[PDB]
Short mmCIF file of C-alpha atoms in Angstrom, two decimals:
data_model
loop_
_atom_site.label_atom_id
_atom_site.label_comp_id
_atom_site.label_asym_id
_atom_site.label_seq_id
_atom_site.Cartn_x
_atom_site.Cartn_y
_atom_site.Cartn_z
CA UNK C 80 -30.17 -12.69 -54.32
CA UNK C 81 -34.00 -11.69 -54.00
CA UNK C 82 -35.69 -8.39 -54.72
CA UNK C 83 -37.97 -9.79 -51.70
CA UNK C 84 -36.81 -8.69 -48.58
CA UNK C 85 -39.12 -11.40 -47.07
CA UNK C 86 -38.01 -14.33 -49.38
CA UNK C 87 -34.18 -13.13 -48.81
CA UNK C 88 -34.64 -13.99 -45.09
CA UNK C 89 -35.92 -17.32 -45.55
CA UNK C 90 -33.72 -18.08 -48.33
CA UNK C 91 -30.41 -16.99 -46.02
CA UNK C 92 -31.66 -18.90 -43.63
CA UNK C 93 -31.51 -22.36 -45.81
CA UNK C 94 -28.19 -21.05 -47.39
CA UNK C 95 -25.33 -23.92 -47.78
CA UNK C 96 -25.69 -27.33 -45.27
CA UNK C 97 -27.78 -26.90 -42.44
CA UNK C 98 -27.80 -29.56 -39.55
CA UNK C 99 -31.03 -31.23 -38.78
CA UNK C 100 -32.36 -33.21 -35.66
CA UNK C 101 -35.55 -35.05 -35.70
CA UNK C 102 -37.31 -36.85 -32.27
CA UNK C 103 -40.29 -38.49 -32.47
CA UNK C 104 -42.19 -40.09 -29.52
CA UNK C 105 -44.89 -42.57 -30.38
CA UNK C 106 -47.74 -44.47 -29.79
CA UNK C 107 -49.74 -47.45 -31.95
CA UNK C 108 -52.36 -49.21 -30.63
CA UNK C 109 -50.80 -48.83 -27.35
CA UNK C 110 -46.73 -49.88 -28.65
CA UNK C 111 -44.86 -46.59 -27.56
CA UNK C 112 -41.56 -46.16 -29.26
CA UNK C 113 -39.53 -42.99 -29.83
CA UNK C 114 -37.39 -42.24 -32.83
CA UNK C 115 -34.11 -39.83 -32.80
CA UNK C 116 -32.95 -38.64 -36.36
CA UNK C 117 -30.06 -36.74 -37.80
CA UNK C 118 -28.29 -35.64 -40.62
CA UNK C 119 -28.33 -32.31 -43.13
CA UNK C 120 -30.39 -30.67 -45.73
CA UNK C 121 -29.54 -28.11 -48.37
CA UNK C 122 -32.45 -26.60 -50.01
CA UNK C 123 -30.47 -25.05 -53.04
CA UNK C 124 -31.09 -28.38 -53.87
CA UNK C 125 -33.90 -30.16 -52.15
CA UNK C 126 -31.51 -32.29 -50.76
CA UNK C 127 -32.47 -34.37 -47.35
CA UNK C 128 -29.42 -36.97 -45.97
CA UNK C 129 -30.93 -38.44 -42.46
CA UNK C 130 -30.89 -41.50 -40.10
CA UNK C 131 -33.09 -42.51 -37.88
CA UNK C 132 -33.10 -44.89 -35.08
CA UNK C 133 -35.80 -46.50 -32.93
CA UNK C 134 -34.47 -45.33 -29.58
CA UNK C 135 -36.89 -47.99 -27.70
CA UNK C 136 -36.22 -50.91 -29.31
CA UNK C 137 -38.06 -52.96 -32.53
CA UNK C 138 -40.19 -50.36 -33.85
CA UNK C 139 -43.47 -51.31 -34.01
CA UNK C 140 -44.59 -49.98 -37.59
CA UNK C 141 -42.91 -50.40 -41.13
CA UNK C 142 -40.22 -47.57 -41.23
CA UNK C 143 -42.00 -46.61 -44.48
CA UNK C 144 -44.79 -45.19 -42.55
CA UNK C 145 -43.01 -42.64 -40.91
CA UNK C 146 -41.05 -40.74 -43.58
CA UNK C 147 -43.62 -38.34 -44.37
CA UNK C 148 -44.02 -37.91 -40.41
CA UNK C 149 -40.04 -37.83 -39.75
CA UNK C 150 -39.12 -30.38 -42.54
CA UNK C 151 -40.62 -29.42 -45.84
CA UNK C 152 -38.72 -25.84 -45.28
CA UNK C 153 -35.80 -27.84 -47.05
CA UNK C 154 -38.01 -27.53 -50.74
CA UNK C 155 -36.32 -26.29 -53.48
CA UNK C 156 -38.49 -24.12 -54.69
CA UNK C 157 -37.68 -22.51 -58.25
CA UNK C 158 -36.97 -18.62 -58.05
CA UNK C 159 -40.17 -17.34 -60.07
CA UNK C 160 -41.90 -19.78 -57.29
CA UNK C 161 -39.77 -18.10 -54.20
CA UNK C 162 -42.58 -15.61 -53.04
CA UNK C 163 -44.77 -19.33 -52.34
CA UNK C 164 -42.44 -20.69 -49.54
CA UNK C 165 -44.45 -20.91 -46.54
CA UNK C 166 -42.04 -23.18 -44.83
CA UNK C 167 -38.43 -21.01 -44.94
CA UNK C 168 -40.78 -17.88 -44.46
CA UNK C 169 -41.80 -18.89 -40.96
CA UNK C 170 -38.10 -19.42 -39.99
CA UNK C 171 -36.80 -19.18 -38.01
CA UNK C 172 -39.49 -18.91 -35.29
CA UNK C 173 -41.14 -22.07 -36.97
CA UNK C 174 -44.61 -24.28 -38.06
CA UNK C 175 -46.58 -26.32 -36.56
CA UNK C 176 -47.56 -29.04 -38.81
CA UNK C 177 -50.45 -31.74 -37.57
CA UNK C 178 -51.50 -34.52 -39.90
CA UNK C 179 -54.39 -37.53 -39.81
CA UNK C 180 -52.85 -40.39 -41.90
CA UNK C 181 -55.60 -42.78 -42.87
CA UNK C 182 -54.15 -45.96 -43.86
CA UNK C 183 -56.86 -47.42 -46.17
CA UNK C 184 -58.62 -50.79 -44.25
CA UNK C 185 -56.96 -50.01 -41.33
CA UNK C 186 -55.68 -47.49 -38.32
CA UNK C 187 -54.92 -44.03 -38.36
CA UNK C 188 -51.87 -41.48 -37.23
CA UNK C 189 -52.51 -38.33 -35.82
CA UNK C 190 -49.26 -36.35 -35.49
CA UNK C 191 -48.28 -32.75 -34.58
CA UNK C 192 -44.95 -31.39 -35.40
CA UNK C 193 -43.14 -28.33 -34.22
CA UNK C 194 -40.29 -27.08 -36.74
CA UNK C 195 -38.09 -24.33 -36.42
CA UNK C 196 -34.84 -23.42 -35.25
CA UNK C 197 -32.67 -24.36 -32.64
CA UNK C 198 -29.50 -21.87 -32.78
CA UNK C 199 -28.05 -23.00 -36.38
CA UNK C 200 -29.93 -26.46 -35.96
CA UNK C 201 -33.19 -26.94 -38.12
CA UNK C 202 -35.28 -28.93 -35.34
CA UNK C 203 -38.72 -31.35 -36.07
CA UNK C 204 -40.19 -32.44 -32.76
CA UNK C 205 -42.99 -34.73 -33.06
CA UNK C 206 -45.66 -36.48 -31.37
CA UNK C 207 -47.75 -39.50 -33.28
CA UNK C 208 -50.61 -41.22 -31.54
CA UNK C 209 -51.82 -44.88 -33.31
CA UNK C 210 -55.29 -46.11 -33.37
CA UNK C 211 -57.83 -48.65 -34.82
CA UNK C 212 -54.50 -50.71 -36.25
CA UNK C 213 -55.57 -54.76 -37.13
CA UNK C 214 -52.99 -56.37 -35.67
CA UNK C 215 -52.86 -59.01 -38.63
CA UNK C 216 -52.79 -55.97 -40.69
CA UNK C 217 -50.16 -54.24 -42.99
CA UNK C 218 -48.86 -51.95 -40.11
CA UNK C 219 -48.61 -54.19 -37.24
CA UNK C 220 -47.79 -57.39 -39.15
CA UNK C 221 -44.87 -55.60 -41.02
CA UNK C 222 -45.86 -56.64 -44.73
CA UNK C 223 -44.94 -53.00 -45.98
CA UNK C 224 -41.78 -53.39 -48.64
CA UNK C 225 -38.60 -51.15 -47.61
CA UNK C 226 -39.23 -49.09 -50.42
CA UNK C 227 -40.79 -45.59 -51.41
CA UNK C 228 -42.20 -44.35 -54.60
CA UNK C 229 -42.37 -40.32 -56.19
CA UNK C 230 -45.50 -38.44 -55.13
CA UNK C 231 -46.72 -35.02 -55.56
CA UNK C 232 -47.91 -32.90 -52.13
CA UNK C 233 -50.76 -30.37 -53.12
CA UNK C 234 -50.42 -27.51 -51.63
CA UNK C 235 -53.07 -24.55 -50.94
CA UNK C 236 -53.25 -21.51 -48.94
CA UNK C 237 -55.56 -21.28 -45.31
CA UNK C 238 -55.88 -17.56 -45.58
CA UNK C 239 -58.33 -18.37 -42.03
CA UNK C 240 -55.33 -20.13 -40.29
CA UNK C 241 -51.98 -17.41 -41.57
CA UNK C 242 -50.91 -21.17 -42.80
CA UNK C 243 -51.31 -24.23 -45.68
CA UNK C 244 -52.88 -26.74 -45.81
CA UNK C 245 -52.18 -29.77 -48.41
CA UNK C 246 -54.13 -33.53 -49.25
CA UNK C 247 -51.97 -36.26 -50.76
CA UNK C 248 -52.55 -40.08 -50.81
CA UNK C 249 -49.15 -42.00 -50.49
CA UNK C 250 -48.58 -45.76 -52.16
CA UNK C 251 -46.50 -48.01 -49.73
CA UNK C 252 -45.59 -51.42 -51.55
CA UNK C 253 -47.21 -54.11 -50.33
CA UNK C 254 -44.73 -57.45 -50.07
CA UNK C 255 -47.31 -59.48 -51.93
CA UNK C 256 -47.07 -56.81 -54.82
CA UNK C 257 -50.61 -54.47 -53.86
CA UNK C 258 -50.47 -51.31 -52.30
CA UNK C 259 -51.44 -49.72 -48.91
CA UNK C 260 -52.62 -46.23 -49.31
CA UNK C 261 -51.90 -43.96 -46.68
CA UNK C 262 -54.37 -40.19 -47.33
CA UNK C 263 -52.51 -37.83 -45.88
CA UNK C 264 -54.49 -34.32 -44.53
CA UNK C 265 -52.24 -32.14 -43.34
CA UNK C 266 -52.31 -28.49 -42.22
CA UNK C 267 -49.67 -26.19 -41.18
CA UNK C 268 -49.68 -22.73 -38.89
CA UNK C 269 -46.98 -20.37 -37.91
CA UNK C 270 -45.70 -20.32 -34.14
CA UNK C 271 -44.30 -16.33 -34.88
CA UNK C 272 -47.11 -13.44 -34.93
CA UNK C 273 -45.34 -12.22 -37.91
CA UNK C 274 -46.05 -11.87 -41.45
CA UNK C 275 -45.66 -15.73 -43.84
CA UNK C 276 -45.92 -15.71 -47.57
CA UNK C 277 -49.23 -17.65 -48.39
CA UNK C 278 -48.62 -19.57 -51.45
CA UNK C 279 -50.90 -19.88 -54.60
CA UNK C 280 -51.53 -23.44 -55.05
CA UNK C 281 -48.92 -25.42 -56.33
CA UNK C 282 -47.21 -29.05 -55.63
CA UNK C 283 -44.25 -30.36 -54.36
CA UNK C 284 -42.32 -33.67 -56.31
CA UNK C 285 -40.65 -35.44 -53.77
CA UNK C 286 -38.33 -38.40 -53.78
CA UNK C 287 -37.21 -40.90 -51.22
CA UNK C 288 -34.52 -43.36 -50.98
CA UNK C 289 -34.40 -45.86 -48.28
CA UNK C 290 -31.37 -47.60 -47.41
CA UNK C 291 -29.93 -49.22 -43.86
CA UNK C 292 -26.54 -48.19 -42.86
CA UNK C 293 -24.22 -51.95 -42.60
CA UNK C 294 -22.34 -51.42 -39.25
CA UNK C 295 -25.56 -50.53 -37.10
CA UNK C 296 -27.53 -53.17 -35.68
CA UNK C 297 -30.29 -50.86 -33.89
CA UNK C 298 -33.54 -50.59 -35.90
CA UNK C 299 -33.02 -47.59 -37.78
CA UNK C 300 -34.01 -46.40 -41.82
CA UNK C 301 -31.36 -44.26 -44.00
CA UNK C 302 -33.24 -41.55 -45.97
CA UNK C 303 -32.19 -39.74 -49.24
CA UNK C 304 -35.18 -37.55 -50.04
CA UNK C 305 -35.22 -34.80 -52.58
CA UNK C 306 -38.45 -31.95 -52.79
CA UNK C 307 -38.80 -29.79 -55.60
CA UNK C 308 -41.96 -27.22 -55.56
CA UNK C 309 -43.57 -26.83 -59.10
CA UNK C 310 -46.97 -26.44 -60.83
CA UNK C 311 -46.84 -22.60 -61.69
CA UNK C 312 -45.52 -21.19 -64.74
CA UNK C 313 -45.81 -17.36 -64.23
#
């Protein structure tokens, strides 16, 4: 497919449906909760089908919150952009990825993420700690709409770090019709020694649908999601 040895490994990797499993354990302002999530992806074409379920109960955030939280390896990225894939290059040993979320006029998450294989099964394992959330707030009083809007991911190499690194602010729909921005920092680093391709700097255009499922009466979110990497020409 590729002249790149390298990108031929990731991109066999990501080749047809691959299964995905997400678990999240969590903490806000003291609420724990844990979130299990499954479904597929298939990064010919961006393509993320997954549902999630609050394991503990009522979660205690908007489900909106979480989507960026709850495996960016899944990207379509164009083939003149193939040689930028950090994510499918550090398959299948994996990334860590860590994030602080700073929801604007209120709390913060703090999350770290291990991604990478588990036998054929593309695995996200998360941990997300909660703090400085008003409890009258958007968060913890639920006013977030079930909803999600299109938003570009910037994405730059960490040369220092063998990883990325990427800023993006995130617009959740308020239900009185503002918005709650959520400024996203993120880095990511390899859990292999071995080589990763370090991208130039380019974006990703992603794009969620949220839906529930009818015959499940657990708390739970339905996520279509398509990323597409862009923002070189070459």
């Amino acid at each position: 497919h590729h002249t790149d040895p390298m990108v031929s490994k990731g991109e066999e990797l990501f080749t047809g449906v691959v299964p995905i499993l997400v678990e999240l354990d969590g903490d806000v302002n003291g609420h724990k909760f844990s979130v299990s999530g499954e479904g597929e992806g298939d990064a010919t074409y961006g393509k993320l089908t997954l549902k999630f379920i609050c394991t503990t109960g009522k979660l205690p955030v908007p489900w909106p919150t979480l989507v960026t939280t709850l495996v960016l390896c899944f990207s379509r990225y164009p083939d003149h952009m193939k040689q930028h894939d950090f994510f499918k290059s550090a398959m299948p040993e994996g990334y860590v990825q860590e994030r602080t979320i700073f929801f604007k006029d209120d709390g913060n998450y703090k999350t770290r993420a291990e991604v990478k294989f588990e036998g054929d099964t593309l695995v996200n394992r998360i941990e997300l700690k909660g703090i400085d959330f008003k409890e009258d707030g958007n968060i913890l009083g639920h006013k977030l709409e079930y909803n999600y809007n299109s938003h570009n991911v910037y994405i730059m190499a960490d040369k220092q770090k063998n990883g990325i690194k990427s800023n993006f602010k995130i617009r959740h729909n308020i239900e009185d019709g503002s918005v709650q921005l959520a400024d996203h920092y993120q880095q990511n680093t390899p859990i292999g020694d071995g080589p990763v391709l370090l991208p130039d700097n380019h974006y990703l255009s992603a794009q969620s649908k949220l839906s529930k499922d009818p015959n499940e009466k657990r708390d739970h979110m339905v996520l279509l999601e398509f990323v597409t990497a862009a923002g070189i020409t070459l």
